[PDB]
Design a binder for this molecule. Structure first.
Ligand SMILES: CCCCCCSC[C@H](NC(=O)CC[C@H](N)C(=O)O)C(=O)NCC(=O)O
Ligand SMILES: CCCCCCSC[C@H](NC(=O)CC[C@H](N)C(=O)O)C(=O)NCC(=O)O
Lengths: 209, 209
């Protein structure tokens, strides 16, 4: 601590981490990089991998958003309670990553044309999480075990951006809905999701949503 | 333990955990799934994300390559020695994933037309790892401190498939070429990189490399 997030002013790949932090009583600083600024060359060359986010936890400066989330699960204890659960929250976040990366392909490289087949192909892609909840206590808790993890935060968001893509896709998936409902009902998250801070910050930055 | 790897007759995405368990003196049963068995549908409906590798470590069946790699790191002590070392081995294995994702899209989507353009972007893609290496003992040891990590194996698999695709790439990356020269040497691994079950396997299946 203190936490400092540097990203472009989109919800993007840091919505999961922002939701984590605010739910887990933590504060953070936002340092915004606009596209004009990014274009002025320096910071992209400072960034290890040319991209964003950049997290600063104290003296540690992290990159790759999944790394950032794993790191806050080790540190804050959002990573299972044993090594089986740990393996499974890995299994599940890499599930959300694979889909998230496909979403990104639509939103930036084929939205208008591809959006079509995307919401058709979606049920088979959201299928595994529906399975996962039924095995984990019949979905009345969390995707891995019975304590929130950093994987509950990255799945809940992937779910939320898709309910915006398709107002209603989660209805085919009744346990997936029960989950989002329950998790947006956790107070610190609820207060966050309803904030100016969250609401007027675009999901993808290019207009598509 | 014991370890069972369930995959197609190709190195591909099990190459790195096979290098890991071989270098660390472990042994595993390879369960070989032919395209004929994948085609006859029963295995797919068992795998949680419809795909393979599938890995059994005793009572755990785990899906997804980097989750297995991350598991063996947690279990066989190969995820660095302290909190900073772990977020950095994850930050490196992530950086690696991003470039493996682009290599499999080159290989199973459009090799022929996409290659020249791929090999054009490669120096800019390998350059982060040279850097990481220079930051630590001038790249005299490993990619994250004193001792080997899962992220060291997986990165080594990427540069070996990349030297088959673009022979001459690593020659400008001397630390990175020496890194391969020194981790290939460690004779438990070196015995494996000349075994039948490694030399007699296709990199990619599709016939491209
Ligand atoms: C203005 C709106 C842009 C919307 C996308 C913002 S994120 C774009 C990109 N970053 C990434 O790709 C982040 C991915 C990285 N692997 C991670 O997991 O953290 C990135 O920083 N790209 C900039 C670049 O490569 O030049
Ligand atoms: C049958 C074609 C010849 C074999 C080529 C190698 S197949 C490897 C491929 N696996 C993946 O894409 C799994 C990816 C998963 N994210 C992981 O962490 O590893 C995969 O399983 N896909 C095959 C499929 O979906 O049928």
């Amino acid at each position: 601590p203190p936490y400092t997030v540097v990203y472009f002013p989109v919800r993007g790949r840091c919505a999961a981490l922002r939701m984590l932090l605010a739910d887990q009583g933590q504060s953070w600083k936002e340092e915004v990089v606009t596209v004009e600024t990014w274009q002025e060359g320096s910071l992209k060359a400072s960034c290890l991998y040319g991209q964003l986010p950049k997290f600063q936890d104290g003296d540690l400066t992290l990159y790759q958003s999944n790394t950032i989330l794993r790191h806050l699960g080790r540190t804050l204890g959002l990573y299972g309670k044993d090594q089986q659960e740990a393996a499974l929250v890995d299994m599940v976040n890499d599930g959300v990553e694979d889909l998230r990366c496909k979403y990104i392909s639509l939103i930036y490289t084929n939205y208008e044309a591809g959006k079509d087949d995307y919401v058709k192909a979606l049920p088979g892609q959201l299928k595994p999480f529906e399975t996962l909840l039924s095995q984990n206590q019949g979905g009345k808790t969390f995707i891995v075990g019975d304590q929130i993890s950093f994987a509950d935060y990255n799945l809940l968001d992937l779910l939320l951006i898709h309910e915006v893509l398709a107002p209603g896709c989660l209805d085919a998936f009744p346990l997936l809905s029960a989950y989002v409902g329950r998790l947006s009902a956790r107070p610190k998250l609820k207060a966050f999701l309803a904030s100016p801070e969250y609401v007027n910050l675009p999901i993808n930055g290019n207009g598509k949503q």
